[PDB]
TrEMBL record, chain A:
Assigned protein family: Belongs to the RNA polymerase beta chain family.
Database matches in Gene3D superfamilies: 2.40.50.100, 2.40.50.150, 3.90.1100.10, 6.10.140.1670, DNA-directed RNA polymerase, beta subunit, external 1 domain, DNA-directed RNA polymerase, subunit 2, domain 6, RNA polymerase alpha subunit dimerisation domain, RNA polymerase Rpb2, domain 2
Keywords of this entry: Acetylation, Coiled coil, DNA-directed RNA polymerase, Nucleotidyltransferase, Transcription, Transferase
GO molecular function, one term: DNA binding
Gene behind this protein: rpoB
A Pfam family this chain is assigned to: RNA_pol_Rpb2_6
UniProt-recorded name of the protein: DNA-directed RNA polymerase subunit beta
Organism ancestry: Bacteria, Pseudomonadati, Pseudomonadota, Gammaproteobacteria, Enterobacterales
Automatic annotation (TrEMBL), chain B:
Name of this chain's protein: DNA-directed RNA polymerase subunit beta'
Binding site for Zn(2+) 2: C485, C559, C566, C569
Domain RNA polymerase N-terminal, first and last residues per copy: 1-185
Chain positions recorded as Mg(2+) binding sites: D131, D133, D135
Binding partners and assembly: The RNAP catalytic core consists of 2 alpha, 1 beta, 1 beta' and 1 omega subunit. When a sigma factor is associated with the core the holoenzyme is formed, which can initiate transcription.
Family, similarity comment: Belongs to the RNA polymerase beta' chain family.
Chain's role: DNA-dependent RNA polymerase catalyzes the transcription of DNA into RNA using the four ribonucleoside triphosphates as substrates.
Amino acid sequence: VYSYTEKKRIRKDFGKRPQVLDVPYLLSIQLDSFQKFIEQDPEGQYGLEAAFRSVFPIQSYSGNSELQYVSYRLGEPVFDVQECQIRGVTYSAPLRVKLRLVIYEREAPEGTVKDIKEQEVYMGEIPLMTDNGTFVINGTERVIVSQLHRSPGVFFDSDKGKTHSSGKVLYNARIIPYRGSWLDFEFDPKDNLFVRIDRRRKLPATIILRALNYTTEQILDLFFEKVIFEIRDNKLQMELVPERLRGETASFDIEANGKVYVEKGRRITARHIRQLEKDDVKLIEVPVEYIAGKVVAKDYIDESTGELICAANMELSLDLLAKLSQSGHKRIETLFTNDLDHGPYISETLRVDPTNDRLSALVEIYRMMRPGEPPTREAAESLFENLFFSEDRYDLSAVGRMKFNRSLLREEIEGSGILSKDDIIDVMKKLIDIRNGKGEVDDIDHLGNRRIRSVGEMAENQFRVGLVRVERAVKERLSLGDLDTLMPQDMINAKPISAAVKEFFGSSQLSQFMDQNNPLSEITHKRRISALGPGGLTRERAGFEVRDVHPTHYGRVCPIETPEGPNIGLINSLSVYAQTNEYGFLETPYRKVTDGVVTDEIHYLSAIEEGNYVIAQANSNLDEEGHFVEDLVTCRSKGESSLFSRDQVDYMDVSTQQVVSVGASLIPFLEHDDANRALMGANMQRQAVPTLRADKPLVGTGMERAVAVDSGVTAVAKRGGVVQYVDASRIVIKVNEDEMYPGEAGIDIYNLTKYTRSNQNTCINQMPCVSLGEPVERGDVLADGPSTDLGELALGQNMRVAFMPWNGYNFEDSILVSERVVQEDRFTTIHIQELACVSRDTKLGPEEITADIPNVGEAALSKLDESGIVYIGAEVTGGDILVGKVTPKDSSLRVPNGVSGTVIDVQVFTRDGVEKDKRALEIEEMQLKQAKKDLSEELQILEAGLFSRIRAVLVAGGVEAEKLDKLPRDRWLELGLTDEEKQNQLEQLAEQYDELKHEFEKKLEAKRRKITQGDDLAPGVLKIVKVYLAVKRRIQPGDKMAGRHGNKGVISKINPIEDMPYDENGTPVDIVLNPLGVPSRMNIGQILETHLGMAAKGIGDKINAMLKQQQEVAKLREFIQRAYDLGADVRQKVDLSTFSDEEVMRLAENLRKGMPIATPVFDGAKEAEIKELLKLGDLPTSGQIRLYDGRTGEQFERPVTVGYMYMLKLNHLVDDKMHARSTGSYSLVTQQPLGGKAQFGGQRFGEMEVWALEAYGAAYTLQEMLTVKSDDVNGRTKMYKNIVDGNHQMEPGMPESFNVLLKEIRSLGINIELED
Amino acid sequence: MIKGKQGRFRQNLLGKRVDYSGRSVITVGPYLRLHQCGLPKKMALELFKPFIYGKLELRGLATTIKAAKKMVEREEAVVWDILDEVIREHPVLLNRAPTLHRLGIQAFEPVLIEGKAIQLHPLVCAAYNADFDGDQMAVHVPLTLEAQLEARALMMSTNNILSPANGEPIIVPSQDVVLGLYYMTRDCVNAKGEGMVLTGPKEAERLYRSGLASLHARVKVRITEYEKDANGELVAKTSLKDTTVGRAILWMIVPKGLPYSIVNQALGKKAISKMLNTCYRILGLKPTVIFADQIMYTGFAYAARSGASVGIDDMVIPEKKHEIISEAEAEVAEIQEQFQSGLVTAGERYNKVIDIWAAANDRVSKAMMDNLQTETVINRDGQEEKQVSFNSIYMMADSGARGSAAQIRQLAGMRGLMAKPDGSIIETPITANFREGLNVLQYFISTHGARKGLADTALKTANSGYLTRRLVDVAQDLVVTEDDCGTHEGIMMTPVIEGGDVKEPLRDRVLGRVTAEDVLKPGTADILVPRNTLLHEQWCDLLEENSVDAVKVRSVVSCDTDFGVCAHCYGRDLARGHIINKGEAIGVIAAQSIGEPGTQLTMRSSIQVKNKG
RNA sequence: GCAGAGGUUCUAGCUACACCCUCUAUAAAAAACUAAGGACCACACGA
DNA sequence: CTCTGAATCTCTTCCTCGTGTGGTCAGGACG
DNA sequence: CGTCCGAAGAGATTCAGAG
Ligand SMILES: [Mg+2]
């Protein structure tokens, strides 16, 4: 079955491989995260209520009064999305939190509270995400890109090589809390364990163990296996186990029960070990030298006096052996040391450690953390327990705890947030084992270790910062203030938390400014994953290994779509199928695979999980019974491609397109073009600007429909139904009876936004895509948004393209464009620029908004109105005055030079208490009338739908059809009905209709109040006049033209239509491209795209010819059926016989301009299929047609490649770049250019340019650029006077910047002077 | 405020933002000559406003400068004519934003155009290292007569044909014109109008334009070749030289002095560079400039006539490629089985797999190349004849217009092993070429190297900028103060040897360098070269004839001049064909010459005699 | 036209980068005309 | 017992020009 | 109305083996 829009135009779909999973909602990541963040959760995890539960003790210190959270609710936003956007105020939902304060009677914490105080406090104004997924912060859309940061937990970095310069490896362990102080352990080149916290000075790692109150002997027991020595008359015979013997040469002969197993100086054999185990003798003779090398495990004290014979962890000596024999202790404990594997690292780092007691360790830790302050025992203890044992100051997230346990291989998944002593000692043991050889260092670049921090988590963290600051303030106030003095509202101040949240949303490295020029750009930016941001890597600190794509990024982030420039690979976009896990780790949908069958159920797999399993290739042929037709199929098990058997396979890729992102997938033939060119093309797609009419891509991925539907620009019907009324401003749908709600459903109404400015100054315009009486199904595209055609994302206009050099006009990357392109306005793009003039309260009286201006032409004043504001719809050019403003004693806003356009609308916002001008009052009253009329029309449309639903029911109950007519239309309750469920339904609808009349008048009054009240303004201004210029940008030489495959080039010249090369049919080629680019940069897909577009246009031309002449519907029907079949099997298998033969004519009417073709990203059309497509049309299968020169007329030898190709006009237009200036306003350094800006100024002549002139034999021109052109006030004035005099003379003088340098050095206290 | 990039030094003293600067995107504009560049009308208006005001006051059209500004704002007709007068002979500097080397900024004689985009002459765009992709160039306007004259004498493009780094010309044809020249200078065994004799280049052009005779066909033609052997005189030589119609047409373009041998060949990019270098050395600067402009025009026109289009069918997959892949699969399977049996260790198994995959890659590359050029067959009036390919891809690769052999292999042959980000070679190479469909895992392996290369390019340009800054700053304390140092001591120059063929012949190394001592002919006690003579092209060729091995050469290090470097010690400037002029800044020239390739630079027994001697 | 003011316009116009005339203590026969001041940090993008 | 060569600890930037977007001590009441 | 609160390397600076 096909939806009606799918019926209107159906893309021919290549690709044999079916998809088991539909593409997920592209914006599901941000929307779902924010939905979790605001949703009330009784469970209280990963939400706002979770933050409240985490931080609201509010316990007064000894005051016995505490405030406890109960509930929080988000009030409806004061302003709607459109109203807040036009006003400039943030789209925010007021946050009112119910809080209960209870007062315990003094001196008895166990006693119940004397009273309970209940109130609701409005704390903080939190932004609310729009349905499109963008926050509105200052009238401008903003979406905070999800942050890719290293997940909390313990990590082990090899740090091999550069450390110690001797090639030694220095293993370090980092315990990174989600919020708190980092804990790091590091191996010295001397192999001593040192601990560094928060990048402080390195300190012996044992010191924390002392701070853990662990005794030294307990430490040595924990980190070493004790070896027991028994005082024996036979020279201290020692209990030895054969296991310790392995890995070490025999320093002494090993004999037990009279049998020597390993000889002196002989390597110990595993056979000897097994023989000794078979003998199973615990005690083995040992010489005096062996115990000398060993280290005593625990302290030993003389029995007679209690003095210690041997200190703990002290090297043995012969006299020490004599002393311990004097002690006579039966059990002697010695550390096991294996040079090969089991190094005694704790021993040496303990020798280095200078503290023998807990208190000294705490003192040293306090000195390290707070140098310059005297240590205090209680203060040091509190500092340490706050650093590592306190929940409030140190917090490890649940994901952090899980990663920590998994790295430590602990069985439990969830544990306490606070770091504990056992956790630290286990980390040290793991690091020691890593140093020994057991285990391996984990990779930070591994995406399993790097979780994605969505917008919800960041908002929660900022909210927690606000909450903890508010909590400290309330704790300070509550203890000071007497109990029951005031209702617990004044103690909570909304300003700190509100300011924190507003600061995060408005001004943040992650709160990127929205790029709204393309729906593809909008989706890509929301899906974008950025390593940059708070708590994340900066651009400079980012390592090379981070930028490079790790093999685990497969199916999780797009390796192709990464922004080139300063941040490469750091800002990689999320792949299309990827979904974040609840812990934040990336998950890729993978099909479950039975031994012989590819099972249909899909299991999401994390990055770490896919390592264990083996994952099949997406491009694996299937027998449709689940069996791979190939006995050996390529697979990615350990991150490396390798052949595998069918039975071995445990998982299969969900689709061929899971590796590429939304932006990258849209490029057809992505497998054919180079990865670098694909990257550049995917970047160029986001930079396209919508044209005046969107044109479907004849060659497309097939995900254009998904992008358009998921993007917020496209208006999709909430409930399917017939369209009773369609209009450019609005579309009204009569909902179907089945899909409509039983009560109050009415009929749906959608208000399309007209031409409005974007954040990138591109028009947003929803053009209706349906006609009156056209049925619309559920989830169907209603109107085409920007760059959208029939629900298909159409970024640019495709046109005939010929690959051939043309007299050098397309030299290496340049592009030649026919005059026909300009003539039919294919790339004319509406650009909307907003200019704001603000009346500022100033000294000498406020600046007036009057029309009258001193020293201006009357012709310029003619365009303005009486009140001083340009008439709506007027045409203005560069230099004209839009709104007249006079400085107190001139300041009238003026069109920037070069900009020429018409004013779509003028909106004026006035502060409360200051009178609105005549034009402002007229605008306000027109707005009131417009809103009232729209609202009343909405009410009467709802009345029509309500009556229509009710009308169908009056047939039952004995009510006559004629009797209904006499009764007034507005009220139908008077007519009585037989009692039934339908009668009760009508009664409920009538009561609801009366209530809706009351609600309608109330809502009209509320809208009037919203419009009537003067808009809030920044302090110091009276009223702000916003005027919008609509400029139609014709395609111009110097504009940037880029295809989807990555071929970018400027339009060198607008060649006349006659000059353009033409084929034998006579159609001149629209664009002429340089073929030489194709071999150098292997974007061979663009040639394949050109051939496929040629085939599509050939089919379209045949259909058009069949439509130009009156042809039987059957003929077009069979032709289109053959076109969709097209030889090789395809997934679509669309049947024309299903169509009603009236839909066939409309489908052909859509197809005549061109035939859409769906090419899967990696399973796209093969060359043979393209050849068959060409053979189906009259066009040659070779893809190259003899082409005739437009001027000479002689057909070119070696027939060129000509075909239709998709081409996007980039917003990088020439007119915006052009910035020539003679003289401009200077800075305080008096360097005249004042920075390169849209405002007039000059380009920088930087250091390398000065070097270039110096290398040349050029000195005078360099002297000019240095002094007379830039920063010589006398020099500049004299130069200008001389030039206008006609004599070009130069006076050197001194640069003002040099005097600035002299004065600055003088300020440093260094005397610098110029010798005479 | 003092130190760092943001410090006042580098922000506002070393490099100062300047007035009369215009910035806009680049455009080709092939119609322009070498010294002329396109300039938008509004951009020239804004840049030249003071000159326009002065000329308006001189004309008497506007009595006051305020009246002149009002006239400019009105943009009336007389303002345009005034703008025409000032623009006519007033050079402007075209400057790409990253000025890697000296040729980064070059003056041009502006030509007013209707539009908003600056047009840069195609030949110099290679020297500017500028593409046509939203690339923007700053346009600075010299003000004083010293400045305009300075730009015309030095900054102008026609004045500096040779790059300072090396004697090779920098305005060499790059993409389209080189392709057109290659298309003209090719022979097809059978073509229209073959085997007829032609009176001269004029008749060849007339035959081609009439269309009865094909552009490339072997025809005997009469050519009036001129020789420079006569001292300051040209002697005409008339002979019947076998050639193609295209080559004969091209001959009328070249100046008289150049011989026919240079144009007789296929004229690849290196061949055209050598042609321009010989023209510069023999005819002089002005004939070289005229010839360069004319050759660019002809290359563009005949490339447009050729229609050398890139197509899918143009690329050919080798028929032997599938068999080679099957054989390599059998070999890797055998090595895998040996690893399973334990006969071969994992490391040696991986090494053998990599080696055999590389061998298969080389074999499929050879098969692909043979299918490109050898496979082309067309008759010679007999049964069959084999000729060099006219396939578009092979024409682009062989001529050197764009790409290289390796990229052609990537397009049609097997791509080859792709490295993992750590640098280790992936065991399984990418079997499918770019023309065929590419597997998902294959694309992932490719994008590993692609992202690695992009990050490498970023670090390359960063480190190259730092190195260029350091090189300039250690440099710039060197100017040619003294004409002759008069020191006998100098460095010995011999051809560089690394055990193989000599990387650089002695002639190229010693070229442009004044001898430290009078060298001796192989005949003993003969003064082949005087002590202090500069080595020009004919002199160096004479040195090759005598086949000298070691030549003592004056070096800047050997020069004992204080705070300066001798002109004779430095040698030829390499900017133009003479000893370096006194006072010129050698240090900055050399620093920029070293720094400029930094972007192209990557970031990362027994003895057998080659020949008898 | 170099220190100020006045003049036919339009509060004020003495070269302020700046537009006309007068003189060294007094104000008008006269048409083209008028304005000289302002940074950093972050994000994204192009090369 | 006094320096040796070595290992560790501290400065110092780490391209170069555009074009657009936004955010920026905040004194605060009192004589 | 005015007025007072990663990485790479170079260099210095310890540092420490060895007569
Ligand atoms: Mg470029």
